[PDB]
Amino acid sequence: LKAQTKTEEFDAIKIALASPDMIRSWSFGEVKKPETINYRTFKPERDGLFCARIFGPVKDYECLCGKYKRLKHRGVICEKCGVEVTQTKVRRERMGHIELASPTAHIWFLKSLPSRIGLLLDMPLRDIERVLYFESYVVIEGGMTNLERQQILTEEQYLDALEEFGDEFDAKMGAEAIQALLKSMDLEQECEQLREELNETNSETKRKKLTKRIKLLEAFVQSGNKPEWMILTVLPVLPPDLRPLVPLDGGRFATSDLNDLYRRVINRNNRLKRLLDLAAPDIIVRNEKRMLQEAVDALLDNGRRGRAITGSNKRPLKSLADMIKGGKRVDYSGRSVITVGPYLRLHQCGLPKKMALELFKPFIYGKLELRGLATTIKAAKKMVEREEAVVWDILDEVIREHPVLLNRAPTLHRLGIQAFEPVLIEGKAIQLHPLVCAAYNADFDGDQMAVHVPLTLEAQLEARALMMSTNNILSPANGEPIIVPSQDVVLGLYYMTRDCVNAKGEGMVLTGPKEAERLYRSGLASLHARVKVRITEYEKDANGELVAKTSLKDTTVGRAILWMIVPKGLPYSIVNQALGKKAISKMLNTCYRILGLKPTVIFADQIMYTGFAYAARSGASVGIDDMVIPEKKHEIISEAEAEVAEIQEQFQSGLVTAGERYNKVIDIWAAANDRVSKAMMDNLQTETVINRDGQEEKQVSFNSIYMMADSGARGSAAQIRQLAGMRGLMAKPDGSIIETPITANFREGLNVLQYFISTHGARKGLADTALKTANSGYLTRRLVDVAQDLVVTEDDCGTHEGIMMTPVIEGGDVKEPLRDRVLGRVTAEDVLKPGTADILVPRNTLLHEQWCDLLEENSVDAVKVRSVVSCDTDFGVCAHCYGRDLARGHIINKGEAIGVIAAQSIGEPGTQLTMRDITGGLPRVADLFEARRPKEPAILAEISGIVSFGKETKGKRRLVITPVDGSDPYEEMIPKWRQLNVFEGERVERGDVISDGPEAPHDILRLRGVHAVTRYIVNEVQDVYRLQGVKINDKHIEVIVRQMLRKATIVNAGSSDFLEGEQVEYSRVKIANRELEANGKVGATYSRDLLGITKASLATESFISAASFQETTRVLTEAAVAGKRDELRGLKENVIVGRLIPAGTGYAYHQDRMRRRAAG
Amino acid sequence: QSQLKLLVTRGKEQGYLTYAEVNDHLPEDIVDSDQIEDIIQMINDMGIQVMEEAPDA
Amino acid sequence: ARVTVQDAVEKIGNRFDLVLVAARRARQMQVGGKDPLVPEENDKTTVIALREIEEGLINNQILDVRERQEQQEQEAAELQAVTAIAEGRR
Amino acid sequence: ETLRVDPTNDRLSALVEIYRMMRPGEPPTREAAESLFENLFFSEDRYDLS
């Protein structure tokens, strides 16, 4: 016995047409005057666009006149002027209406792609539906003689037909004519007769329009909306506050364009009302009606036809629709320039004193008044406004364990916003941990980040348990660590290895920590020798725990002292025995997988501190003599120019093909470039001589630059090759290459010519960079919009099927293996073993248990694994079928947000993608996801049969292949263009190649199989990242392809109406509820359909979510026609409404509320 | 005939949606702000089937 | 749990419910009946709840049960007033 | 081929067709259809290559 009549909690919102009486329900009065504000008193007019009696009072609680002032009469209206004295915010919510004389057509339901008023009535839009209501050609409204029911007549035809009959087929013209036309229309009887007629002896020559309109008519009649509301007779008014005329600075009012529109429509409507009382000339009144139509159409939605103007501005007027067709500023926030903070930890950030003072203002107030000090709230304000020392100490209390999350401008992925613990710093800049400075893709060029203060209690815990930097150790994209040490730190730890012979070396042995005393006390060097020491190692096995292992290994000084940083576990020494390069991340990785979170974090801090400290101790610099040029440079150049000279001389005397000597001479300079590069590298690498004991030996150059190159720290082969070697073949604006490479280098001088040549590369480089940077996000938006609705739910469902995972092998003719694509994956079912047993059924491939897939030899290179592609889930994703790949080591928590994380991870490396039988680059990725047919698509055999010619070019035609076997034939169409691959008589299988060209994803999914098409997409999208060298897990690709295969097409006979292509969501849930419901014959069989990201995102349940990205004017209108309702599980549509997101910290709320909405 | 065959045969699918093309191959008085929306609505979005909803309209 | 917080999730799966229950307990402490279990040591209510969960005490079923006892204590112990009001409108 | 697809046949129909192409609205006359085309490429006040 509920039935409450207040503003409580809503479970859904409904959209539909509005009746004239429905408009009256919102009406708090009727605007009748074009007047707005008084010219002198600046007071709201009687019944103008800004009435006080109709809408709301100007001041809060005092009326218009002033008979009543204070809160004494808040429920009683004024005597002299019916003004309800409540609030001033009432003026913001009060509606109101205008009641027009002659009917008027709504611009949306009239001319918006399909003629909603036309298609429902079956009548031409801008052709017939225009001329009959613009007062030109009269229309019929049902005739029982000579005239049909919807024909168009002229005035001559009208009077003639009227004279022949008349007084028994009356049919007006104009707006009200179309009104009676829609009103007289019977949706029910037409729904019956149309179903009857559009089914009688008709092939595929009619079925199109038949099924279309019948579904549309059925939708409209079931919607509840009456076709009468199609053209409005009462036009509601938007609240004054949402279109105010506020005085600016020194007079000069500022009003909205809507006021101009409403003022115009009011004027024309009034004159129309006055003309229908005075003399009534047909031409004058009919014109005023067309003018009234103009005003209304302009107010509702300008668009669209010439564009109304006035208001002095040459620019159009922002209509109602224009204000809702096409960034959330927030309190408790700030921003500033970032700065490196070495002394900081991994979970801390440098927050400015004055900045943090203003941020936690309300918290400082409360805490002050809590302890004492400030007698009141305003006392705290005056106490912090006058920074009185003691207040700062209070600040140290409020920001104690109150996390603050930082954010960078280019937010590509989830690690764009990470939380930290605030640490007061005497300065006006924000300091950041140099480790998480890579996740942000942030540099200190002058970049500035923003800070937000988690106000809510659970918001603070959200920032601490989710957005905290310590919880984001591994990248969401690839399982590898993200906080891995970079340039400076890695260079330092690289210097802490690097075994140099002799030089204060000798094998003076000690015991770990003791060696530290040796280093500070000079005597011995640091990069020697090697030298032996006692290492107390620690390992565990089977029953875990710890097993000591003291030994005597031959390391170095650096390795020994650096060994102290290494945590309890780890293989020890051997991780330090190497050097500093890429294993620097490997060590961090293994430390995480064998120990845990905290140990990995402290290990990261220690290796960072150590790296920085010893890096400073090293004093590695970059002099001009550090980049040594090869002596054989001029030799190589002369030899190369000698060869090209011979080639040019040959070209002079014919002989060689002059048409392509350009290419071969390029090979000459290119080969020469490799000669110089190889020479420089072989030189700058080794070198040195030292003098070990009896002298004479060779190691590797301690040449700073090389040290930077052989240890990450921003230094690649190509760059170094340009520093001392030479800049090779340079690009030309034509797209061609110049046959005179930059012989010189940056170490040497650069001629004006070759620099004016390199300026092109730099220009196109920056230009292309600017393009792909915005284009990457351009792709990300489509990815997110289509995927940001699926969330891992229902724990872990059943099913065993799943793509058979195999190492991506180009080794067929090039040799290239990759077999790490199986880890943290939930096994399908006991994937065999050369003998028996072994792998379990649903056992997720552990990080240590994937190394067990090497103890089964190279024989086992194929394992069936559950993926998001398959999964017999409904509206979510099985936890097992997904994986575990996060910053977390375990499986994805139930109710995460796979969609956005997947899309982000995909569009994150988009910045480093070079746009162009191999397209390659970002455009290749876009084409693969959009599922576009190639420029020369191949063809396959749909059914296995016998290949034979089907009448050599007898059409039309063009060759024809007919693979017929078993039963029934097929006639494919070959257009002569492009050859073949299978002779006549030969047999083919189900999906064989008969064109040997580019394959179309649609054909693969349609014929080959879902596993095949998904394998195709993932293995083709990776191949463009292989070349770009961007590591990204296949899971996310499988995630987007999952809902990429959202909808399908049924072909048989069931409760669903055949031709309708519907998503496998309702399909599967309904086919499961039909085999054991009444009969399996009341349902049909479906067939998966491949549709691109854009095409897939276009279709969605919520009309609000759709109103977001795609054209609002369309979706909102069509959703208005049929009584649709969002209810209401989508992420996007639940964001603009301002409520808990149906995922993450929420979900449980939505789950409880979802089950709660089952009672009624 | 003319409008239908030209629109369909040409736009397949004009790749970058070459708007400044067929709008000149249309009769009647030009430079209008009315026929502008009726072409940007048919090319994309509801592809294939929309190109059959255009001629009929 | 000043740095994971990861050691608490394995005590109650899905970090999200961890946040909910932890926020629940922290809500009890910050306003109303405080009484922490793990020693404060000058820490905010944000982390105190997490430390308790890590300690092994204060979970979801625990809080719900203690809420049941709390309701049975406020209601059953003060029914003499409600029963006297029940005779108000017969 | 250009002549084959040319509706106009004289000077009047040409200027009228151009007048209807440039200013779609009012009925093309004699003075307007001529003066319009003249004030396009044959008048300093309406056309100038400097």
Ligand SMILES: Nc1nc2c(ncn2[C@@H]2O[C@H](COP(=O)(O)OP(=O)(O)OP(=O)(O)O)[C@@H](OP(=O)(O)OP(=O)(O)O)[C@H]2O)c(=O)[nH]1
């Ligand atoms: N895992 C865990 N760590 C805790 C816990 N309580 C405190 N810590 C550690 O406390 C350390 C900081 O100690 P302090 O810098 O002196 O601050 P405290 O005054 O100790 O606060 P306290 O009383 O302990 O809560 C951190 O160092 P770090 O080594 O992490 O920072 P890093 O590795 O970067 O050095 C935390 O790990 C806890 O309940 N769980």
Ligand SMILES: [Zn+2]
């Ligand atoms: Zn009053």
Ligand SMILES: [Zn+2]
């Ligand atoms: Zn599943």
